[PDB]
Design a binder for this molecule. Sequence first.
Ligand code: HEM
Ligand SMILES: [C-]#N
Length: 137
Amino acid sequence: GFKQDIATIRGDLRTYAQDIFLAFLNKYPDERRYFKNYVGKSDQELKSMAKFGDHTEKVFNLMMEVADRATDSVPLASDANTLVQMKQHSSLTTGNFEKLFVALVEYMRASGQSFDSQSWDRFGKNLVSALSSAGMK
Ligand code: HEM
Ligand SMILES: [C-]#N
C-alpha cells in the first residue's frame, strides 16, 4: 500500500527521485522553465549533474516525509503550509503540483514495481486541496 510505497521510494531515493522528476519535466516541458539550470539537458546529462541529484533527492525526501506524516493520504495542514511558504515556491500555482502528481502516478502505473498508484493520486488531490487552502493561487 501507500506506506510500503514510501519505503520503496526511500530505499532507492536518488533513482526514483530522478526518474519521477524527469517523467514530470518530460510530460510537461513548460515546467522545465522553472529550473533554469536543467534547460537544454537530456535525461542522462542530468543524471551526471551533481546539482540535479541533490535537488531531486531533497525534493523527494521532503515529499516522503510529508507522505509519511499523512494519515490515510491526507497531508498535515502544517506540511502544506511549509510547501506554500517556501521562498522557492513563491511563484507557483496548484496546477504545478497537479502536474507533478499526474506524472508521478503515470510513472507508478507504468513501472514493473508494484505501487498503490490510486492512493498517490488521492494524496496528490488532497495535497492540492491543502495547498489551495494555505494560500496558493
Ligand atoms: C510536494 C511537492 C514538492 C516538494 C516536496 C518540493 C520540495 C522542494 C525542496 C525541498 C526544495 C529545495 C531543494 C534544494 O535545495 O534544491 C525545492 C525547491 C524548488 N522547487 Fe519544489 N517541491 C515540490 C514541488 C514543486 C513544483 C511542482 C515545482 C514547479 C513545477 C517546484 C519548484 C521548485 C523550484 C523552482 C525550486 C528551487 C530550485 C533551485 O534552487 O534552483 N517545486 N522544492
Ligand atoms: C522542487 N521540486
